[PDB]
Amino acid sequence: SMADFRKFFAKAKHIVIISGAGVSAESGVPTFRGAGGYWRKWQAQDLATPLAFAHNPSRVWEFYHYRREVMGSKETNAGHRAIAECETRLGKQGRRVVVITQNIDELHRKAGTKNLLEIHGSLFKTRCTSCGVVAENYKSPICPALSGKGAPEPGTQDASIPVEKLPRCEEAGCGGLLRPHVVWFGENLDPAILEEVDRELAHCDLCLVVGTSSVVYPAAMFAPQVAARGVPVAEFNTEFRFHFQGPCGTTLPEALA
Ligand SMILES: [Zn+2]
């Protein structure tokens, strides 16, 4: 019960919050998973791959430029804010709150989350395919050749941008082709991020799963090994161990008050 879960929440000195696509969808974010896993003639699973970027980097850039640009009109919801406010309060008490997420839209960052573990990278981060440098990039568009490009509708002509006119590395004497700093399909997670993650899960005394569940990716990598230690896990979704049904923007302000 919410009443018994708040008994744990008050005693909990290290809370791990696993945030799923649901936390992002509640803010009207095009989650390119399930029914909405489409951008024109293709599936998101067909565009987010090292082979797709190798054959057509311009098409993969048109798709990722679209995703960066849809965020302009998007705001952090009541769930994100409740999560950010919780970490601030408990922080002043010498207690820990950390957010583990595969959402690449930075709405936890805009909310005010500090202990944020983005296991799949960010839309607003680049990586040079040549020198390997990682950089923050919020520039709109990312490059002048992508001005007015990336429309989601099928049939839309391919921008057909030559590699030289695509996003390039601003490091002195590099000029290498940039790629978004996001984990693609068949790509491994950063071992540094997973080390940090496994460290969090090993030290926490309370674990929450929001906008996803322990039976679907990525919570299935983390929440069950937590439950196995006898640490309480509380699931929160639209569908000890707790379950709180409903939109996280409704249930989390109450739970994390
Ligand atoms: Zn470079």
Swiss-Prot record:
Domain of life: Eukaryota
Tissues of expression: Widely expressed.
EC number, UniProt record: 2.3.1.-
Protein location: Mitochondrion matrix; Mitochondrion intermembrane space; Cytoplasm, Cytosol; Nucleus
Reaction(s) this enzyme catalyzes, per UniProt: N(6)-malonyl-L-lysyl-[protein] + NAD(+) + H2O = 2''-O-malonyl-ADP-D-ribose + nicotinamide + L-lysyl-[protein]; N(6)-succinyl-L-lysyl-[protein] + NAD(+) + H2O = 2''-O-succinyl-ADP-D-ribose + nicotinamide + L-lysyl-[protein]; N(6)-glutaryl-L-lysyl-[protein] + NAD(+) + H2O = 2''-O-glutaryl-ADP-D-ribose + nicotinamide + L-lysyl-[protein]
Sites where the protein binds substrate: Y64, R67
Residues annotated to bind Zn(2+): C128, C131, C169, C174
One Gene Ontology MF term: NAD-dependent protein lysine deacetylase activity
Activity regulation field: Inhibited by suramin. NAD-dependent lysine desuccinylase activity is inhibited by physiological nicotinamide concentrations, while deacetylase activity is not. In contrast, resveratrol activates deacetylase activity, while inhibiting desuccinylase activity.
Keyword field: Cytoplasm, Metal-binding, Mitochondrion, NAD, Nucleus, Transferase, Transit peptide, Zinc
Entry annotation: catalytic residues: H120 (proton acceptor)
Mutation effect (R67M): Increases the KM for desuccinylation. Does not affect deacetylase activity
GO cellular component, one term: mitochondrion
GO biological process: mitochondrion organization; negative regulation of cardiac muscle cell apoptotic process; negative regulation of reactive oxygen species metabolic process; peptidyl-lysine demalonylation; peptidyl-lysine desuccinylation; protein deacetylation; protein deglutarylation; protein demalonylation
Binding of NAD(+), residues: 20-39, 102-105, 211-213, 237-239, 248
Cofactor section: Zn(2+)
Entry domain remark: In contrast to class I sirtuins, class III sirtuins have only weak deacetylase activity. Difference in substrate specificity is probably due to a larger hydrophobic pocket with 2 residues (Tyr-64 and Arg-67) that bind to malonylated and succinylated substrates and define the specificity.
Other observations noted: The mechanism of demalonylation and desuccinylation involves the presence of a 1',2'-cyclic intermediate, suggesting that sirtuins use the ADP-ribose-peptidylamidate mechanism to remove acyl groups from substrate lysine residues.
Task performed by this protein: NAD-dependent lysine demalonylase, desuccinylase and deglutarylase that specifically removes malonyl, succinyl and glutaryl groups on target proteins. Activates CPS1 and contributes to the regulation of blood ammonia levels during prolonged fasting: acts by mediating desuccinylation and deglutarylation of CPS1, thereby increasing CPS1 activity in response to elevated NAD levels during fasting. Activates SOD1 by mediating its desuccinylation, leading to reduced reactive oxygen species. Activates SHMT2 by mediating its desuccinylation.
Sequence similarity: Belongs to the sirtuin family. Class III subfamily.
Protein name, as recorded: NAD-dependent protein deacylase sirtuin-5, mitochondrial
